Write a protein that binds this ligand. Structure first.
Ligand code: T6J
Length: 149
């Protein structure tokens, strides 16, 4: 069983946390976004999402970097930084991910996610968990890299 906690989308960008812990590799992140018919955001896409109201308190992949978007300074989120905070030094490789859905609304979309449209056949139950607790479950797989399996 896999839980995927997702957020609001902001200019198409959203955050995905797997199994309540930093547990996604960069290869898995691309596959996971592909399951949402999405891609890893570019830094420009992320900056526009930030400008629409997106912030999290979790490291996640974008294309090329691991970041935390921050609007409001918080001492426990990205060392009190604002803007798209870029992780510079870390020993480790597993984070959450951001994803970008080009078909989402242009600004804040805080409706819930009710599908995992591009998952593959598989036996494991994947549950999308919204911030409001609503859930969408479907049996499937999204990982293509043997290293992640
Ligand atoms: C339980 S796990 O350590 O997150 C490995 C895993 N990740 C998956 C993603 C989709 C379907 C099955 C999956 N099994």
């Amino acid at each position: 069983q896999i839980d995927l906690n997702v957020t609001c989308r902001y200019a198409g960008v959203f955050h995905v946390e797997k199994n309540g812990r930093y547990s996604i590799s960069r290869t898995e992140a691309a596959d996971l976004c592909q399951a949402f018919n999405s891609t890893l955001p570019t830094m420009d896409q992320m900056k526009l999402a930030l400008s629409k109201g997106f912030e999290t308190c979790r490291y996640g992949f974008i294309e090329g970097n691991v970041v935390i978007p921050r609007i409001h300074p918080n001492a426990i989120c990205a060392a009190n930084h604002t803007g798209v905070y870029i992780l510079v030094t870390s020993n480790t490789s597993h984070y959450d991910t951001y994803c970008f859905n080009a078909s989402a609304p242009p600004e804040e979309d805080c409706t819930s996610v009710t599908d995992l449209p591009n998952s593959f056949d598989g036996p494991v139950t994947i549950t999308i968990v919204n911030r409001d607790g609503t859930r969408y479950s479907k049996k499937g797989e999204y990982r293509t890299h043997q290293e992640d399996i």
